[model samples]
Target: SMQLNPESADLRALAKHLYDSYIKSFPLTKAKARAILTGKTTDKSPFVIYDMNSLMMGEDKIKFKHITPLQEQSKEVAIRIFQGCQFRSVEAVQEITEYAKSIPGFVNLDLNDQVTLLKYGVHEIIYTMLASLMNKDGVLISEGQGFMTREFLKSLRKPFGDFMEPKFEFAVKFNALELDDSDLAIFIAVIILSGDRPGLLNVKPIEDIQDNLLQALELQLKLNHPESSQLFAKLLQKMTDLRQIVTEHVQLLQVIKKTETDMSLHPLLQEIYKDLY
Candidate 1:
C-alpha cells in the first residue's frame, strides 16, 4: 500500500473518505479497493499518475495547498512522479501491438481462419471501404469474407501500427449463429485499424455504415455472453438504436447519389455507389 501523508489533515481526510466509501459500497471490494486507493498515493498506474498531476491536481493537490500554503511542495512532488513515467507515442503503440499479440490463441489461428477473419476483419473492412486512406487495394473485403496477408499483419506492427490497436466490438447474437471469439477478434481488430481512414477512403458516407456495424457487433457479442443479464438488456436496445442510425445514414447517402446529376460534384461518392445491385 502506498504511504499517505497523514500529518496533512486534508490528505488524511481525503484518503479516509475514499476508504470509508469503498467499505460501505462493496465490503468485498474493501481489500482490493484499499490496496488500490492506498497504492494510488504512490504506486500509480500511468492513467492515475498522469491524471493526478495533469487533470486532477487542481482538485486533489490544490485543495491541500489552499489550506496549507506550504503544501506547494506536495504539488511539485506529484508532478515529478508524472514526469518520470511519461512515455513516447511509439512506446504506447508498441505496448498495444505486443498486447494484441499476447492475447491468448491469437497467433495460433489457422490460415483460413485468419483470412476469413481478416477479410471481415474490421481493419480489412475499413481498408476496403476506405482504401484511399491507406493507399491500399482491397481484393473484395467484407464482413463475410476475411483476410490475413502476411505483409498486412506485419504492417500492423510498426509505423502505421498505431491504427491496428484501435478499439472494437462484435455484436455476436445479431447473426443468429454467434461468431467465435477468434472471428470476433479479427473483426474488431480490422474495425479498430481502419476506423480513422475516412479521409483516405474517398467514400466518407460509408463511414456511417462502418460505425453502425461496430455498434451492432458489440451488442451481438454482449447478447451471446452467458452472463448477459440485468444491465446487458440495455445493450439489446442499443443494438436497435445503432441499426436505425445506420439505416438512416445509408438512405441519406443513397438519396444524395440519386439526386445529384453532375456526378462530377462527388465523383468519389458516385464511384463508391456506382454498381447497382
Candidate 2:
C-alpha cells in the first residue's frame, strides 16, 4: 500500500491545523445542526422557522412573504439590525482575535499590526461567515429562525439602510461556492493576513504567511472539490470580490456616521471605526 505522494503529503498537517483553529473558533454544535435539520429552533417563538426555500422557488404556498419596514415598525427593526451588527462585531473581534492566536503566521505578528489586520479584515470575515446563515432570500439571524430578506434590506432608509444589500450580493455569490467551515478557515486566515492593508509597514512577513495560506487554500480546494477543474482558481479570485464589497460598505458606513448625528456604535467598534475613518 503506497502513501500519498510527497506533493500531497505536506498539506494534510497544515490543512488540519488551519481547520482545527477554525472549528474551535466558529464551531457549531449538534443542537444547532439539529435545529437546522429538524426545522426546529431553540428560540421560543410562535413563528416556526421553516425552510427559506419555502419562502421562494417552486414549492407550496408562502405563509410569510418578506420582512419589510413599511408594514409595521420598520425603523426600529432596521436600526436594531444596524446596531445588531455592531454588537456582533464586538463578539467577532473577541472571537476572531482569539482564533488568530492559535494560527502560526498570525501569532508571530506585532500586536499593533495584528489588531490593524483585524480592524480592516473583520468585516470580510463576518460577511464570509454570513453566507453560512444566508439563503437567496435573506440571512438567518438570532437563531436559525429569524430571516431578514433581500429586498427588505433594500427598503431600508437612504444611505445606511442598504449596507447589507451589497453584502447580500457578495453572499449570494460566495454561498454558491458551497464551502463548509474547513475550507473557510484557510480563506479567513488569508483575508486577515493580507499584506495590502493600509499602514502595513513590514509586508514581508505577511506576504510569506499569505503565500503559505494560499497554498493551503489551493490544497484544500483540490481535496474538497476534486471534480471541479477551476474551483481553486475560482476561490482565489473570491478575495477581490470580498475586498470590493468591504470597501464599498466601508464607504457607506463611514458616510452614515458623518451625516447622521445619532449613529453610535459599541466602544470597541467605535475605536475600530475611528481607525478606519
lDDT tens per residue, model 2, 133-198: 666666565434455566666765676568777777777787677676778888888888888888
- What tens-digit string does per-residue lDDT give for candidate 1 at 81-132? 2221121112223223443333233345443332233222222222212211
Best by TM-score: 2
Q: Superposing every Cα of model 1 onto the true structure, what RMSD results?
A: 23.1
Whole-model lDDT per candidate: 0.30, 0.68
Model 2 misses residue 245 by how many Å? 0.7
Candidate 1, number of clashes: 22
Instruction: Assess every candidate by TM-score.
Output: 0.22, 0.78
- Count the clashes in each prediction: 22, 0
lDDT at position 213, candidate 2: 80
Report the Cα lDDT for candidate 2: 0.68
* lDDT, residue 106, candidate 2: 80
